[PDB]
Paper text:
Nitric oxide (NO) is an important signaling molecule critical in the cardiovascular, neuronal, and immune systems. The enzyme responsible for generating NO is nitric oxide synthase (NOS), a P450-like heme thiolate enzyme that oxidizes l-arginine to NO and L-citrulline. Thus, nNOS is an attractive target for therapeutic intervention. In our efforts to develop inhibitors selective for neuronal nitric oxide synthase (nNOS) over endothelial nitric oxide synthase (eNOS), we found that nNOS can undergo conformational changes in response to inhibitor binding that does not readily occur in eNOS. Here, we used a combination of crystallography, mutagenesis, and computational methods to better understand the structural basis for these differences in NOS inhibitor binding.
To explore these questions, we “knocked out” the active site inhibitor binding by mutating the active site Glu to Gln in both hnNOS and heNOS to generate hnNOS E597Q and heNOS E361Q. 4 binds in neither the active site nor the BH4 site in these hnNOS and heNOS mutants. Most unexpected, however, was that the same backbone changes in the region of hnNOS residues 598–611 were observed when two molecules bind to wild-type hnNOS occurred in the compound 4-soaked hnNOS E597Q structure, even though no inhibitor was bound in the active site and BH4 remained bound in its site. In addition, mutating the active site Glu to Gln in nNOS resulted in the same conformational change that results from two inhibitors binding. This suggests that when two inhibitors bind, the first one enters the active site and hydrogen bonds with the active site Glu, lowering the energetic barrier to the conformational change required to bind the second molecule that displaces BH4.
Author numbering:
A (entry chain B): 303 to 722
B (entry chain A): 303 to 343, 349 to 724
The structure:
């Protein structure tokens, strides 16, 4: 370091990174090993296991409050020094402190801005922040989440949003959305060993069923919300169906494609991540933007028990499926992604293709390097899962590093929860 | 750090890496920045005696360990013999067995190579007695003929004399042994392979008379003993080529495209025991997606990707039609179909990545790990429908290794006036 250059090998544009000097947490890499493809490479946290002591929390608070007041050209201002004194006394009397609305908004936007894995970040400063820190019950969380879904969906003109529930206190009163996303389809393990619905959600579906949910065992079964407030046992809630925008998937040239009876939901809303601002941990911070078409996992969706939507498309396309070298998987994959984009666009539901999104991300990187001196970026996650080398991010070198505020992963609550 | 675990999020298979404890050279990353997607993180800069000794001992220790003779009298005398050579001559010479072992493990250690399940079957051609570019040409012709094997390709490496003082390097100035020329036209269009315009200009500048055709095999530009490079024309009957056609699009053959059967990387440096083999052309066989025919500019400023989409009557107005994606798949279908039809070895990215996963698991079992560069192992298309996408990998640099080295035209001290 001192500065680190990244090069685009198509355009030969070189960007020079100084922002990485502000990085706090370990990537997991060393001089001798690179962990760039490990999902969860580092356990390096800014605060310890449980209720931090003052000398563990206040340095983190000061750093964030310093960062925030710097960001508004108010460093050392009257309001800044007062805020530090305020945070100091709050920690002294409660072992935590409470963000101001401006600080919460600033922190959530920057956690997104710092999300190295997110290709959508050109939009980062246009995040609608819903303060839900007054919420006390799962019912209130359900209400907050319904309003989020309604606002974000916006009749298909999707709007970036995050709803932030009360921060962690002692780790035994966590707010959690047990759902990984607010809207997902059930996965049903079948007695003949196979899977019905979305196979990614089989375990959570079973948890819901175990928690009393009566599964329709139908086709595209929207999973209930499993909401945990104040560390209590989670509670089941059915999202009002009129709040769940769905796009029937059809194909602009394959008339048979709609006969697959496929649909997907318009709003992707990640709800299992942890938002970390100045040592404060918001274990329930569901956020939503809009889909990049490649994200829509309708390809893995199982409508029967012995075949998959990829294979089913390839069959209806009369592709030879004996040998891989026919690229029938690649052919069908493209066609499914054409259908998804075509269907969302026809229904006027916000969606971005991976060409437009990666092109915007390159534009975002240029902006960030110009104004901020860097942009943390995880090539492994930024490059789209299809047609990687014909998108502009492929030949774009990227530096990955951990800035705070940040979105963090956290354990699945059912592994960690003590029932009552 | 005893153990490191990599998980496959598709299969849930967890592998434990101990082999990373043996790594010695940098990855480029630091504890706070990952440089995993950075491409690469003086001639006098040859190993001093004191630098060379421990690199040599590290290699010899590793070799005698591999043949279950570590600490043996043979091991000890080889060590002593190597140190005497470094003491007197400031360098030392690999035994033939050590050279073979070393080239094979440089491939085995190539974290960016998806084809490593084959590593132990490499044919090693010892060309360390070579002294001139003519001799290099002869050695390279024999490599091409042996590796091509009338389309039943065989992996091979040809190793020219190691670096001495940095002023006597052997170099293949070609990036691959067989490439097509690229010619920039006055009107900004490109004829042939736009990837090779720069090297083509060097060749013409060295006196090569270019055919200025569409698929002109470039001349070999060969440098021996630090002398100026010399041009040689590969005998055309040694260059196996595949006309590219499509199993369904009859018009694809009318694009008049072909590609060469033998990918043979010639610009890397082979490092064994601190010794540097600056000329070590090696070859296996293509993965279909490597073949750069799509970037090829037959006739004009437009390339085969665009031309194929045009013939496919694709809506090229908007990106969200995914016409680029569709034409990309069709080009890769045509490439695999053509090679297979002509019985020229090729692997598709599905087969290649599935084999890599098997290879990686076997390496974890028998070797304690497999350094792998996800950024380069995942194919350049359809990444997530291949098994490596969900495969966590640990990247680390083991020696012997293949390394990048500067382009020779940037560093060569020209002799001829
Ligand atoms: C506005 C449109 C957005 C688009 C197109 C987008 C796109 C993406 C994509 C493609 C990924 C890779 C993960 C995957 O493949 O599923 C990702 C990851 C991520 N996004 Fe965005 N995103 C958007 C909005 C947002 C917002 C509003 C936030 C938070 C305020 C956010 C935070 C994140 C985070 C933290 C990750 C990493 C998640 C993980 O590690 O699993 N994104 N995004
Ligand atoms: C036998 C079939 C082989 C296949 C299918 C194969 C495939 C590949 C692929 C797909 C890459 C990624 C870089 C790229 O996109 O070109 C790669 C990289 C590499 N391969 Fe292999 N390879 C094979 C044989 C070999 C052999 C015989 C050697 C050396 C003895 C070798 C050494 C390397 C090295 C050093 C790299 C890294 C190149 C770089 O960093 O730019 N490979 N290989
Ligand atoms: C093992 C691998 O690193 C991991 O599965 C990552 C790879 N890159 C990814 N990239 C995106 N966008 N989404 C993903 O889930 C993943 N998975
Ligand atoms: C910027 C990026 O890291 C670089 O261009 C790499 C990415 N991965 C790659 N992977 C393969 N197989 N081949 C390549 O040329 C590249 N390019
Ligand atoms: Zn790294």
């Amino acid at each position: 370091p001192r500065f680190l250059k990244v090069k685009n090998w198509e355009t030969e544009v070189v960007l020079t990174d100084t922002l990485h000097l502000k990085s706090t947490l370990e990537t997991g890499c060393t001089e001798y090993i690179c962990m760039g493809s490990i999902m969860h490479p580092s356990q390096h946290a800014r605060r310890p296991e449980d209720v931090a002591t003052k000398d563990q929390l206040f340095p983190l608070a000061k750093e964030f409050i310093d960062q925030y007041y710097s960001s508004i050209k108010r460093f050392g201002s009257k309001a800044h020094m007062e805020r530090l004194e305020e945070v100091n006394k709050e920690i002294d009397t409660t072992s935590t402190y409470q963000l101001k609305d401006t600080e919460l908004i600033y922190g959530a936007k920057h956690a997104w801005r710092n999300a190295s894995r997110c290709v959508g970040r050109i939009q980062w400063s246009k995040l609608q922040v819903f303060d839900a820190r007054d919420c006390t019950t799962a019912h209130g969380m359900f209400n907050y989440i319904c309003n989020h879904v309604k606002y974000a969906t916006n009749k298909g003109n999707l709007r970036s949003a995050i709803t932030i529930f009360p921060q962690r206190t002692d780790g035994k009163h966590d707010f959690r959305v047990w759902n990984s996303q607010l809207i997902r389809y059930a996965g049903y393990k079948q007695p003949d060993g196979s899977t019905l619905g979305d196979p990614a959600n089989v375990q959570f579906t079973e948890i819901c069923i175990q928690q009393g949910w009566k599964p329709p065992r139908g086709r595209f079964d929207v999973l209930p919300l499993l909401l945990q407030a104040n560390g209590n046992d989670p509670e089941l809630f059915q999202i009002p169906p009129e709040l769940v925008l769905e796009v029937p998937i059809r194909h602009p040239k394959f008339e048979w494609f709609k006969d697959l009876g496929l649909k997907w939901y318009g709003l992707p809303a990640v709800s299992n991540m942890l938002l970390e601002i100045g040592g404060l941990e918001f274990s329930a911070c569901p956020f939503s933007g809009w889909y990049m078409g490649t994200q829509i996992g309708v390809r893995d969706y199982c409508d029967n028990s012995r075949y998959n939507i990829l294979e089913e498309v390839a069959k209806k396309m009369n592709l030879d499926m004996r040998k891989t070298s026919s690229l029938w998987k690649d052919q069908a994959l493209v066609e499914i992604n054409i259908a998804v984009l075509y269907s969302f666009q026809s229904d006027k539901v916000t969606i971005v293709d991976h060409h437009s999104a990666t092109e915007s991300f390159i534009k975002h990187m240029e902006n960030e390097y110009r104004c901020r001196g860097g942009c943390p970026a995880d090539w492994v996650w930024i490059v789209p899962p299809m047609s990687g080398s014909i998108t502009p991010v492929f030949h774009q070198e990227m530096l990955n590093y951990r800035l705070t505020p940040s979105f963090e992963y956290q354990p699945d609550p059912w592994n960690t929860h003590v029932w009552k």
